[PDB]
Design a binder for this molecule. Structure first.
Ligand code: CL
Length: 92
């Protein structure tokens, strides 16, 4: 049920979300890769009084800074394919 939990957060309502964009998605809008987790935990998100959500940026700052000088695992949900995968990014 880790998959379901990440999607619950992603779909909870209107908001800001984080996405993964490759070099060609900007030219070719045919893949829609949402970030659903970092390091196998859901993206932490704040839901306001009006039902709009945005990331818990302080918590995300801490997650990224824990990975300074090494690789962060980014959990992706591809909207069209309906599949999960993991990408890896070097954090300076
Ligand atoms: Cl990288």
């Amino acid at each position: 049920d880790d998959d379901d939990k990440m999607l619950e957060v992603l779909f909870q309502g209107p908001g800001l979300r984080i996405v993964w964009v490759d070099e060609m998605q900007f030219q070719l809008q045919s893949f829609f890769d949402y970030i659903v987790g970092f390091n196998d935990d859901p993206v932490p998100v704040v839901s306001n009084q009006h039902g709009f959500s945005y990331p818990d940026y302080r918590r995300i700052t801490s997650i990224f800074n824990e990975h300074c000088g090494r690789t962060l695992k980014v959990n992706i949900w591809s909207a069209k394919g309906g599949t999960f995968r993991d990408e890896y990014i070097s954090i300076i």
